[PDB]
Amino acid sequence: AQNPNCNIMIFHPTKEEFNDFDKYIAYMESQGAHRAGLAKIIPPKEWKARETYDNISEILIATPLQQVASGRAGVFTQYHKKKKAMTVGEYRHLANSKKYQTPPHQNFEDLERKYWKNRIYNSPIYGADISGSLFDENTKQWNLGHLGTIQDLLEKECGVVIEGVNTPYLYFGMWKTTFAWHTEDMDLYSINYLHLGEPKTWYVVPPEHGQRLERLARELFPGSSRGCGAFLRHKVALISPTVLKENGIPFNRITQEAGEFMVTFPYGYHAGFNHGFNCAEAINFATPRWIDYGKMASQCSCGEARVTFSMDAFVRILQPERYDLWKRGQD
Ligand SMILES: O=C(O)CNC(=O)C(=O)O
Numbered sequence: 575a576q577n578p579n580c581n582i583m584i585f586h587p588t589k590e591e592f593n594d595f596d597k598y599i600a601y602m603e604s605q606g607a608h609r610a611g612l613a614k615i616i617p618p619k620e621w622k623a624r625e626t627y628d629n630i631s632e633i634l635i636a637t638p639l640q641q642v643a644s645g646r647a648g649v650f651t652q653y654h655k656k657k658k659a660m661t662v663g664e665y666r667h668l669a670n671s672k673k674y675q676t677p678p679h680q681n682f683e684d685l686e687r688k689y690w691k692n693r694i695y696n697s698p699i700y701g702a703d704i705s706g707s708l709f710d711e712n713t714k715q716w717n718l719g720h721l722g723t724i725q726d727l728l729e730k731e732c733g734v735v736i737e738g739v740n741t742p743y744l745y746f747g748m749w750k751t752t753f754a755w756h757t758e759d760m761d762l763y764s765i766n767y768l769h770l771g772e773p774k775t776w777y778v779v780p781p782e783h784g785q786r787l788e789r790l791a792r793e794l795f796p797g798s799s800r801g802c803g804a805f806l807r808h809k810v811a812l813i814s815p816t817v818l819k820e821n822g823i824p825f826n827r828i829t830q831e832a833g834e835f836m837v838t839f840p841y842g843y844h845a846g847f848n849h850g851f852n853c854a855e856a857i858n859f860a861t862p863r864w865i866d867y868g869k870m871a872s873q874c875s876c877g878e879a880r881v882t883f884s885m886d887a888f889v890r891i892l893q894p895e896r897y898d899l900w901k902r903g904q905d
């Protein structure tokens with residue numbers, strides 16, 4: 575078996591190997607990359623996502639989210655308080671202010687220490703889940719706005735034709751902005767490109783061990799667990815590397831820098847934070863190996879997680895039994 579210790583693998587495709595997305599994903603998996611739950615892909619040196627970022631200040635963040643923490647430094651929840659709209663210009667100015675800017679630090683490890691020590695005492699503002707793309711339409715390789723759709727994958731694998739579309743989202747981050755422990759909707763893959771700015775640190779649990787993370791989460795967030803049988807779909811819970819180590823949960827960590835792709839694999843729980851002002855673009859995607867994960871994915875039926883138009887059809891076709899009660903939570 576390849577990659578038995580489930581380490582995060584880093585790939586360096588040539589421009590030749592960067593032409594066929596599906597085939598390169600299948601290659602990574604042949605080398606065991608999926609066992610980690612997360613891979614890094616460094617694009618060929620000749621590739622660019624777009625010519626410059628010079629005019630991005632006019633993008634609107636219509637609902638910035640202030641991420642308010644509760645609990646203890648290593649085990650906390652975050653609530654998203656909706657703020658007034660601001661442009662990317664305004665946001666970047668805010669991120670760079672004395673109140674929100676990245677503190678002095680020696681290296682990524684010192685900054686990671688400061689993050690876990692101090693995250694709870696600040697409420698950074700996250701511009702998340704903004705429908706859009708920053709790839710130039712003339713970028714033909716690994717353009718997250720031109721991937722084949724999950725609906726088309728299901729059609730090609732399973733023969734069923736469903737409604738729905740699949741488009742990317744932009745994320746504008748600042749120091750301490752945080753993504754809580756989650757797998758993707760319907761345990762899909764995701765791919766994330768860091769377009770510009772400061773790094774993003776990731777933590778991930780191997781898919782084969784995801785249930786161990788869930789068991790810990792139920793113990794650490796006991797009332798959440800009683801309220802919903804898939805409360806990690808709410809994307810509010812954080813657990814530090816220290817706490818994961820104390821409880822024997824297998825995980826890995828890696829820092830993504832501007833110009834790099836990360837791919838999360840089905841049922842690979844991940845969480846992380848931003849080092850400073852940045853802009854990422856991400857989208858979900860499917861392969862043939864995903865299909866069974868889609869059939870087995872947990873669902874939030876308490877009604878908090880409240881998910882897309884397109885996810886309806888996935889649940890309808892892959893999880894017909896659930897479909898009924900899941901849509902009671904979604905209506
Ligand atoms: O970048 C972020 O804030 C969150 N991204 C993801 O969870 C992902 O790409 O799967």
Ligand SMILES: [Mg+2]
Pocket residue numbers: 629630631632633
């Ligand atoms: Mg603009």
Ligand code: NI
Pocket residue numbers: 756757758764838844
């Ligand atoms: Ni994700």
Ligand SMILES: [Zn+2]
Pocket residue numbers: 801802803804805807808874875876877878879
């Ligand atoms: Zn729920």
